[PDB]
Structure formats: structure tokens, C-alpha cells
Amino acid sequence: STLLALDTSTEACSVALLEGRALSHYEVIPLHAQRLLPMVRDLLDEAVALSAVDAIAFGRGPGAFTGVRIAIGVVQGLAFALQRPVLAVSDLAILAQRAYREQGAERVAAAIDARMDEVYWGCYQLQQGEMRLAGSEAVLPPERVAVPWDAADWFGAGTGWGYVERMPQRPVALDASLLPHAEDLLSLAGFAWARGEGVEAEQALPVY
Amino acid sequence: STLLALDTSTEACSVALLEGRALSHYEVIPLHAQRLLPMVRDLLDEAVALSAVDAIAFGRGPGAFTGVRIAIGVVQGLAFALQRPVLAVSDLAILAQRAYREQGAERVAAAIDARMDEVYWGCYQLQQGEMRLAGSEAVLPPERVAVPWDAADWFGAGTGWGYVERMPQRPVALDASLLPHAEDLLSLAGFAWARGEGVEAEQALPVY
Amino acid sequence: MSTLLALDTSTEACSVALLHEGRALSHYEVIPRLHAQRLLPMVRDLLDEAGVALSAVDAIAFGRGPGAFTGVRIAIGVVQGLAFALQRPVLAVSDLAILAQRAYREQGAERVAAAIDARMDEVYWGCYQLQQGEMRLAGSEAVLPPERVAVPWDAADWFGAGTGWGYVERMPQRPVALDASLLPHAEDLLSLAGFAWARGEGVEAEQALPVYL
Amino acid sequence: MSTLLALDTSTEACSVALLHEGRALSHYEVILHAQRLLPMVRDLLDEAGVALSAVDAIAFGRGPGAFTGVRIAIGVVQGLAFALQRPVLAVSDLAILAQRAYREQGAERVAAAIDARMDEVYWGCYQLQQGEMRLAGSEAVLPPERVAVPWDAAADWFGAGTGWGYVERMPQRPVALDASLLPHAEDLLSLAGFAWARGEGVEAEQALPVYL
Amino acid sequence: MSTLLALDTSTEACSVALLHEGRALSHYEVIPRLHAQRLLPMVRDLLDEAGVALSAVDAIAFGRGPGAFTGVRIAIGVVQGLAFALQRPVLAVSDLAILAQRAYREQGAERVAAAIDARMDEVYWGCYQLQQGEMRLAGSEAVLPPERVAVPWDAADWFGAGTGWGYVERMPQRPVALDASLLPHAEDLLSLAGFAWARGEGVEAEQALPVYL
Amino acid sequence: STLLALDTSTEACSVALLHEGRALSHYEVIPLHAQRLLPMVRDLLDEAGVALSAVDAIAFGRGPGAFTGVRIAIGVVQGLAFALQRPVLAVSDLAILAQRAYREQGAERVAAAIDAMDEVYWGCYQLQQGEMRLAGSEAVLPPERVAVPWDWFGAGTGWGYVERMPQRPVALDASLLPHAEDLLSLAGFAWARGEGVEAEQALPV
Ligand code: NA
Ligand code: NA
Numbered sequence A, B: 001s002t003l004l005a006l007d008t009s010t011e012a013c014s015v016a017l018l019e020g021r022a023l024s025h026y027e028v029i030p031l032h033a034q035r036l037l038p039m040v041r042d043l044l045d046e047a048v049a050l051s052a053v054d055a056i057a058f059g060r061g062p063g064a065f066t067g068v069r070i071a072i073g074v075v076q077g078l079a080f081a082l083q084r085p086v087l088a089v090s091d092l093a094i095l096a097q098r099a100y101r102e103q104g105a106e107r108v109a110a111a112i113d114a115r116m117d118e119v120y121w122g123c124y125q126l127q128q129g130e131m132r133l134a135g136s137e138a139v140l141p142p143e144r145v146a147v148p149w150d151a152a153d154w155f156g157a158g159t160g161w162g163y164v165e166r167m168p169q170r171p172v173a174l175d176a177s178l179l180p181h182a183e184d185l186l187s188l189a190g191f192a193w194a195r196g197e198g199v200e201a202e203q204a205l206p207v208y
Numbered sequence C, E: 001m002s003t004l005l006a007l008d009t010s011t012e013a014c015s016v017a018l019l020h021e022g023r024a025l026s027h028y029e030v031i032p033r034l035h036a037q038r039l040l041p042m043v044r045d046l047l048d049e050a051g052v053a054l055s056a057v058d059a060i061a062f063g064r065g066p067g068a069f070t071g072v073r074i075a076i077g078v079v080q081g082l083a084f085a086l087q088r089p090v091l092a093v094s095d096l097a098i099l100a101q102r103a104y105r106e107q108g109a110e111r112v113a114a115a116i117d118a119r120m121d122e123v124y125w126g127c128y129q130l131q132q133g134e135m136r137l138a139g140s141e142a143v144l145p146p147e148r149v150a151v152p153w154d155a156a157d158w159f160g161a162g163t164g165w166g167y168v169e170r171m172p173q174r175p176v177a178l179d180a181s182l183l184p185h186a187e188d189l190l191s192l193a194g195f196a197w198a199r200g201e202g203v204e205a206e207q208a209l210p211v212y213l
Numbered sequence D: 001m002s003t004l005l006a007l008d009t010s011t012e013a014c015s016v017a018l019l020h021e022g023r024a025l026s027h028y029e030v031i032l033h034a035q036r037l038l039p040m041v042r043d044l045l046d047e048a049g050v051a052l053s054a055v056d057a058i059a060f061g062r063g064p065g066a067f068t069g070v071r072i073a074i075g076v077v078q079g080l081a082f083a084l085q086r087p088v089l090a091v092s093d094l095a096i097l098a099q100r101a102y103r104e105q106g107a108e109r110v111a112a113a114i115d116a117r118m119d120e121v122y123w124g125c126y127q128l129q130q131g132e133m134r135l136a137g138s139e140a141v142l143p144p145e146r147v148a149v150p151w152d153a154a155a156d157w158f159g160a161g162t163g164w165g166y167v168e169r170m171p172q173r174p175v176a177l178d179a180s181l182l183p184h185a186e187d188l189l190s191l192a193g194f195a196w197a198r199g200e201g202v203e204a205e206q207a208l209p210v211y212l
Numbered sequence F: 001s002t003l004l005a006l007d008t009s010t011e012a013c014s015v016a017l018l019h020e021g022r023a024l025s026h027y028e029v030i031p032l033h034a035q036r037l038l039p040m041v042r043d044l045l046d047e048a049g050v051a052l053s054a055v056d057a058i059a060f061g062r063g064p065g066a067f068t069g070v071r072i073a074i075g076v077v078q079g080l081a082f083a084l085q086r087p088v089l090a091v092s093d094l095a096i097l098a099q100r101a102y103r104e105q106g107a108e109r110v111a112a113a114i115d116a117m118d119e120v121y122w123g124c125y126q127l128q129q130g131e132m133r134l135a136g137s138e139a140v141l142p143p144e145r146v147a148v149p150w151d152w153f154g155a156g157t158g159w160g161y162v163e164r165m166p167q168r169p170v171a172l173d174a175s176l177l178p179h180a181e182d183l184l185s186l187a188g189f190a191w192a193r194g195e196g197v198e199a200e201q202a203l204p205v
């Protein structure tokens, strides 16, 4: 199947696509309503028809309030006119999958920086090929943050780890600069698409 | 020509369409990423094919920072997949055209409420069939606001007129509750489309 | 003529009111967040005392917020349920507006800056001005730190209404007069609902929704 | 042979234009210029298949107009010009309007007005002299009530620019006017042609905005 | 080895610096907003004094903001122009970071909360922590009223750097030590640019852009 | 260090001198600066028994304030310094107000304001070791938008537009203008820190 993947939930702007081949475009600059569409076009041509796309995946957040919503609106529009379904994926999960692909982390406590001196928090454990949510995602002060494993070896991924000193527990290793990447969204979309998780364009929405 | 018109720049959510017939759907509720797409579908069917649409018009703002951007992203997506051009129209202008259609105002000082104790300000004068910007749009404190006519009879339209008491001049009549309406955007789009003002989906952007 | 039901649970106050044959009746109690426990019993008691059947109700007004997240949503649910089952319209009205209209009933203020305490050290804020009996909004409603707050008037006498005014010392302007204990009251929601019902502003139960600021 | 590159971002218009081997090319888009100006410059040199090394002078709109927009153009021009070791040609945006209005409507006497901040207009009057719109008097920033032409009460003249949205507060008005004209780099380039011919070019460091 | 040019005009300070053959040279002047008037002459003088050709420059670093709206954008323009004409990459670096790295050079602080005065009674804010020679950002940068400001540390010694700290009395935390006069300095931009150039973070001139917060 | 200080920023015209650690000042309100400044310099110089060649540096109010008066004091200063081959010290008029209001009314913190068309010049200063130092940044703003960085005084012509500030102060002087003696004070601080520059670079805000 051919799948398209967009993410504008952070500073990062990223798009990716899966005939059987898989390609990725990733640019860090804070604007998203400007560079998104071009990145789409650049990728479709340097690889493929748009009406050939079977489903579109997106970061649903959490992240930037406006950022996530720009991607949603684009995806909402693209998918409606194409009449194809969409694939809602968490940005904390994408971070999880990224820290897997990049550093081989099988247990990832993902944390993205939030407003009002808080962090978005989500813990992910590798099951089969995929990072999968352990418990639930939350918006917490860094001092209230907690993991669902015993402390085992686990990894901290994302900007929320700037607040590590204020947290009650720290992993062996961590990357405070990781951001959701469209490649990883695409991996996660594979699992979701194969499980028939797609939904109609309207139901594409950000998380609360 | 067949034209589609969306606006989510304020509390108001509105969509409109022009074969030769003209229809409008208008709902006031603060959410926009939920009700927009449905309103599109409801209108296309209760009147017409989506791939028959020749151009799409939108409120470019000013207004709600996120609100305008949701409409943009939708329009950006719709238009790209359809491969049709778009029609950028100011929300202050739509207010102008609304106050014309509704109360017969040929000179309209449009004012939309803005952040940080300011108003978005734009003055419009009826030329031929259309309200047209007199000077330029700005973001001002209400005490610095000014009109480009002599004080003649002119109208105040929009939420910025809550601050009327703080302004240095007041019109004969005003409506502090007017909001941009997709019908009026569609009128304004007629003039813009007939003048060949359309642009490629990417260039669809909010005003600063 | 019109029979209207009004419910509010947006703050510490739980209140309900009924317009029937030009007469208005109200029950108002302050509890903290036992609202789910007490909102229906109150509707029941009010209808019972008035001798009015629920089927007689033409529209249900509710406080739409802002205020407590769970509080507001309890009102929303009950109202949704009632109006869907009856197949009647609902009227959404702001709690800041309700504050404004109450300050006008109790203290005679015609120019009110309604403020409600909010989470995370902000306050909800909306300024209202009397027009033909109805306190109508001037500008927009917002959630702001009390420092960034501002009125749309110039020399004008105005009133500070609501528990947001507990932050008055942290706020730029102080009004001539103020009341920081004041809560939305369903009797005043009923007045505002009347004006809205006259303009036919009612919606279907599915659209009985809280505001986001 | 003189090759001239021309940039303008003084108003909501963003335009570039090139003069090479007696040919004039130009792009124009109405929409944050810092994102757009340089890409436009690239696309243009490409479309004409010319290299930046060939360019002999860089012309720019020196204002009046948007405070930051003018400065974005001045900054790019300064930077291009310094690295390239080329001179720069400062041209008024009121003049460019006048030159555009002449090209587009044959007006030989143009009162250019650009809407300015704080309820004023930028005002300058121009008249054709050997194919170049030349300033008659001074440029000013004025309330529209205090605006005046240097000509006798209607030969006819023309009102050009967004300052003309204030026509009703002005003490006189022309027979014809276009309150929607904006500077266009094609006209900047015509004007640049004249200034280059009189050796008006200056060092990159001196590319600066005007204050009125 | 690498020859790098660094320009900053984001605040009242106009500065420029050059890395050439391991040696670093700088010019720094405080003027108010005559930047367009003085930025190129400064580049010229610096190159002249160093005896370095502009063609020798491998990359141009710039302060990307936050700071003055027009100030920042003047730097952007000049840099865009220079790098496009030369066909060399640019390196965008935060002015809060520059502040942080300067406080580390001058006062030896390893934990800095950089704050810059901003329009409309807010301040720009970003907290930085030394890592292998480089002050690296901890969390995110923001524009906040000085009341809502907060650090990502616990017991830890930290430094307040920049003119945002003119609002220290209105701010929740006060650090052990502070400097509210401190401005971004191009010498320190040059250090940060080095780390970025080592990781190959350079972009094309068309992407030399200011930040939005 | 012998320091000469000049101000014509506003309507008031003033000059001051620091010789042999003694500080002397002449102040005169006159709406005429291109006419009375140099006489004042010569008179003050006579009265101190000092020759202009003695002077090590020249301080001046760089603005903001009346555009004409500022531009003349700047010009005079540049001329004096070029010819004597002496460094110059640019000091804000808002800082000068804040230093005056300290010296005169005891104010440990001041919010200086000077009327400009509609807007007013704004700057807030705090005392730090006898010197009124700037808090945030100086700004030009409309009276309503004006903020504060915090028992605090309000100084300058711009405090005549007091209503809807939004904040009103403890006490205030709306007719307070810059004074050379307080420019002198501030200059001594600047001098001692090596803040001098070339005549070429004396310039307004
Ligand atoms: Na609160
Ligand atoms: Na104007």
C-alpha cells in the first residue's frame, strides 16, 4: 500500500511516503503553513501520483497548539478531496519509535515540552515491531512524572527532558533534543493501517 | 464558474458555494477543526461535484490566530488535491460587504477584536459592486483608530466596536456583533476571480 | 407566554430557575462540587413547587462557561439529556454575561467587568454593557493573567463582578465599586435566555456545548 | 552593456527585475518578504539564464513605505552589493509609482501617495521629463488635508498609490486616479536605467532608507 | 581551519566577529537602532584588520532573534545577501543562546536563564545549560509575561542574564547572581556557530530566517 | 577628571562642570537654545576658573526630547570634541530625569516619561550604588500601553498624559525636565567605566 505521512507538531516539519519504497524529508524551522505543502509536492515527484495514495497519516499531537492544527487541516483537506482515510498517531509515540530506530531503545519515556511549565508525558515499550503506549498520555509538571516499569533500562526522548533535574527519576541515557520525525510516523502508520485503524477525513482531530 | 468559500476566522464558522446558484451555511460556535469539513459535505450534496469546483475562497484574517490557520490548512489541502487555485480575501473586507448587504452601508469602518487590547482596523468604500480597502489594514489601540473620509455618513461593523467609547470618532450607526460570513466572502471572491487574482494552493497564507 | 428552564453549575453555585406565565422562580445553593448530586433534585423540586410539567418547557437555558471544567460539563450533560428526550431547543449563555446581568439586578450597574477565577493563575474576563434591558458583551471574552486585563470604556462608571476580582490588587484598573463574592445565578440566566429566545437563538441538544477560551 | 538587478519590498508587493542585453524581465507577487525576496531573485536569474557575476549595479526602493519591509530590501541589497563589489542605485518608491502610472496609463503628471502610519500619507509629485518621471518639489509625510500639487489647476494629472484612499480628506483631487498601485520592479528598473546613466551609483554601505 | 563570520544586531548592540586560523576577532558597539547604518562598515573593518578576504569565509553565523523586530531583520537581510552572493551556508543561532554563552565566558556560569526585554510588556526567555563547552537549550524558548517565567532546574546554582531581568521583581524566581545589562555579543555567537558548524548544521541563504515565539 | 556636560534636550537649557572633584551647574528654562547654550558654557567656565583645554570628556543628553533642541546640543558637542580632541559620553534624557528625581525627591526608583505626535517617550530606572540604571529598555509608546518593571516616582513632561496609564504612581512631577548636574552625575559613572567615544559617533536616539 501507498501511505503519506505529515508532522508539524513541533519545531520540526516533516513528510514521508511509502509503492514499496520509503522516503523522508525533514527540516527544522519554526512558517509551517508555508513549507508543508511544498515538501509534499517535492516528495511525490522525486519518487508517484497523489491519487495513488491509499491513506494519510499525521501527528495528532500533543505539541504546538497551532502547529498540530495546521497539519490536521491540511490532512483534513487532502484526504477529503482524495476521498481516502486518515491515520491518527501520537507525537509522543513517534518520539518513542524514533529513539528505537536511532539508539535501539526498547523502553522509551517520551516527553515533549508543554505550556505553563509542564510536560506532555508518554511511556512506550517495544512490542513486536512497534513502540506501544504503556498506560496513558498526560500533561504533568515534571515532578509528578512517573514510569510504568521497574528501575531496568529505559530511555528518555524529547524536549520535556530539559526538565530532567526536576523529575523524580532519570534514565541511564536520554536525548533532550529529539523531535517527531515523519519516517517514524510512517512506521507507526504501517502497524495502524494493517490493523485497519483508518477513519474518515472529518474525524481527523488533535488530542486533548 | 463554480466557487467554494470557507471562513473560520472568528467565532463564526461558515461555508458557501456558487453552477449559477448561490447557497450559504452559517453556525456560530467556538471546535472549528471539527465542524468545517462536515459543512462542506452537507452543502455540496444539498445543492454538486467537488471536482467541478473551479476555485476556493477563504478568509485570510485577521482574526483568531489558530482559527484563520485551520481554514487555511483545509483550503491548502482541498485545493492541492483538486489542483485548483485559491482566493485570498480579508476578513475586515467581508465584514464590510456584510454591512453593505445587510444595512446598505456604502462606507464601512470594519473593526475586529484583537489580542493585547487592540483592534484590527480596516475601512471600506463601495466601488462598483464591491467594498474596497481605503488605505491599509492595521492593528491598533482603539484610541489611534482613524477613518479616511470626512465626517459624511459611515458605518461601524464588527466586534472591535465594543471599544467605541475609547475611539476618537464614532459613526452614525454601528453593529458591534457582526462577523465575517461566507456568503459575503463569495461575493468578494466573484470580483477577485473575474479579475484573475487566483493563486496556487501553497501561496494560501494568513495575513500579518 | 413562554416556559423556560435555566440551569447553572459553572461555579461553586448550583442554581435553577423557571419562567412560567410571566412569573420567575429560583433555587440557589452554594455547595462545592457536589453538583452532579444536586442539580436534578433541584429541577424536580422547582417544577414540583411551580406545578409545571416538564413537558410544558419550551426551551432549556444553561450556563455555558467559563468556570469549573467538570462543573460546566455537568450542566451540559443534564441539559443535553433533558432537551434531546423532550425534543426541545437549548440556549447557551455565558457565565460572565450571567454575572453581568446579576450585578445589574442587585446593584444597578449598567457597565460591568465580569471576572471569574480560573485555573493556573489566570482569570476569565468579559466586559458587558446594558442595552435595552440586556447586558450585552463589549469586545470579547478571554482567559488572561490578572495583570493583562483591560476594559473597553474610558470618566465612565463601571462595576467589577465575580471571584476573578480576588486578584484586584494584581490588576491594572480598579473600579469605583466591586463585588468579588458574586456568582452566576440562574434567575439572571433566565433573563438573558428570554432575550435570546425572543431573537429565536435556540439550538438542538447536540450543540449544547461548553466554551473554550 | 549594463546589467541591472532591481529589488522592491517597500509595500505588500514583492518584486524583482533584471535588465540584461537590452532585455527587461520581472516577477511580481502580492503577499513576510524575508521568506520570499531572495528565492524570487534566484528564479528570475534562472528564467533569464544569467549569472549574478554579470550584474553591474543593484537598484532598490529606498522607501517611503513599510518600515521593516524597506529595511529587508536594503539589507539584502547591501549584502549582495558588498560581496559582489557592485554599486547601488537608490530610487524613491513614490517615483516608482509615478513611473508605473506613466507606463500603465500614459500619465505625465503624477501625484504619488503611499499610505503611511499614524493617519498620514507619503506624498510626492512627479512629471515626465525625457521619459523619466522626475520629482517636482519634495517628498513629504503629511496629513492628507495638507497635501498640494505643484501644477496649475488642471493640464491634467493623475493620483497614484494607496495614499489615495484618503482622497476625500484632500484639498483637491485629479480626474483619474488609481488608489491600488504599488511599486513594481519593472518601473524601478526603468528609473534605475536613468540614474545609472548619470553615474548616481554609490557604495553598498550607503544603501539606506529615507526619512521624510 | 574554518573561517567563520558572525553578525548580530538583535538588540541595542551591533557586533561582528571572525574566526580565522583558530584566532577570533570582534567589534562591538552599542548604538540605538542605527544598525543598518553600521553593520556593513563593521564587517568591512573587521575583514580589513584581519587581512581576510570575504571569499575566504566558509559560513556566516547570525543572531536569529528574539529581540527587536527590525533589528533582527537587518542582520537577516545583510546575511542573506552576503551568503547568496558568495554561495555559502549560514548558521542560525538564538540570541538567548548567545546571552547564555557570554555569561559563561564572562562570569563562568554553567546554568543560565537568558531573558531579553520584549514589546508589550513581555520578555523573551530561554534557559541554557553547559554541555561539552556549549550552552545548550533546556526545554523551549518563549515570550512570557515576567510573572509566568520558570526554570527547568531544582539547590542548583544558576544565573540571570539579559535585559529581561529588569523585570526581576515582577518574576517568581530570583537567582543567586544576575546581570541585566548584558547583551548578545558576536564573539559568543562565533563560539556557538563553531559547534553548529562541526555538526554541519548550515543551511542555504534563502532559509536565513528570524524566529517567531 | 574634568568633565563638561550639556543639555538642550527640552525647553530647559543647562550646562555643568566637574573640576577638582567640585560639581557646578547653571540651569535656565527658555523656550532659543542655539542662542543661550554657548554663553552658558562660557559663563560657567569663567565661574569655575577653568579653561576648556582642561576638559577630559564631554557628556550630553542624547535624547529623547524636543527634536530641534537635541540636534543642536549634539552638534555643539561634536564640534567641541572634534576640536579639543576629546571623547564624548552619550546619556539618555530619561536617565537624567530619573537621576534628578532621585537627587531632588529622594526617589529610589523612577518611571521617566517625555511627550513626543500622540505617543510618549518611556523609560524606567532603578537606583544601584547612587546611579539610576535602566531597567528594561527605553521605548516610544502611546500613554495607555505604558508598562512598569515592578514606592516609585513618575518624572517628566510625558506624565501630563497621566490618565489611563494604566498605573498611577505614589507621587509625580509632570513639569520635570533634564538638568545638567544630573547628566554630570551619570557621566561620572560612565566615565569611570571607560564608556567614552569619538566625536564622530555622538548621535541621537
Ligand atoms: Na486564577
Ligand atoms: Na495612514
Ligand code: NA
Binding pocket: E117, E118, E119, E120, E121, E122, E123, F136
Ligand atoms: Na517587556
